[PDB]
């Protein structure tokens, strides 16, 4: 019954990850304890969640928990079919051992039609975003980046870079070309604000 503890931690972390992306999540899911998780729900196909977005109610996300410890191209297709038929665009695949290396470039191959993304199970046992040293990241909107570049007379290159595989760019699901504001809690100035172009 440690499998259930792992399932509960991963589900709580994914609920927090979905709330930080701006999806409609209730307080109970974010404050759900183990005794009630196991009360509700055992399997790995009824842990799949489907969440809606604050705006764009059609824009929803779908979280998978594949059974195969090493997901492959066929496993990816089997529920890319589910997504294509239910009419969703985004997904999130929590894998237990990894993805066979061809799969990673397949997930990338699926054009903005159906954009997927993978997360290891050991990466979700804790919320890195809740570490002391990790600042708060905020994906800037297309109209705030323009005002930033205009205030500092900048170009989008010539800005600090954040890797597209950064453990906190993968969590906040930030695509390339997006600028993220970062609020460092500084011992010197309190709440220093920086900006990083995702690339």
């Amino acid at each position: 019954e440690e499998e259930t503890y792992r399932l509960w931690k991963i589900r709580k972390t994914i609920m927090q990850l979905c709330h930080d992306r701006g999806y409609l999540v209730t307080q109970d899911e974010l404050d759900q304890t183990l005794e009630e998780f196991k009360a509700q729900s055992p399997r790995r196909t009824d842990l799949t969640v489907l969440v809606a977005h604050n705006d764009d109610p059609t824009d929803q996300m779908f979280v998978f928990f594949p059974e195969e410890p090493k997901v492959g191209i066929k496993t990816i297709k089997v529920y890319c079919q589910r997504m294509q038929e239910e009419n969703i665009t985004r997904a999130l695949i929590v894998v237990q051992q990894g993805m066979t290396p061809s799969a990673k470039q397949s997930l990338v191959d699926m054009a903005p039609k159906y954009i997927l993304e993978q997360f290891l199970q050991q990466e979700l046992l804790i919320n890195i975003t809740e570490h002391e040293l990790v600042p708060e990241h905020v994906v800037m909107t297309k109209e705030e980046v323009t005002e930033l570049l205009a205030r500092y007379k900048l170009r989008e290159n010539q800005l600090p870079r954040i890797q597209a595989g950064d453990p906190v760019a993968r969590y906040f699901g930030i695509k390339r070309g997006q600028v993220v504001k970062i609020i460092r809690p500084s011992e010197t100035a309190g709440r220093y604000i920086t900006y990083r172009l995702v690339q």
Binding site: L159, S186, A189, G190
Partner: peptide, 13 residues
């Protein structure tokens, strides 16, 4: 030298 922003405020303040 090339304009690359290292910091947006020197000491963070």
């Amino acid at each position: 030298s090339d304009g690359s922003v290292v910091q947006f405020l020197y000491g963070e303040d």
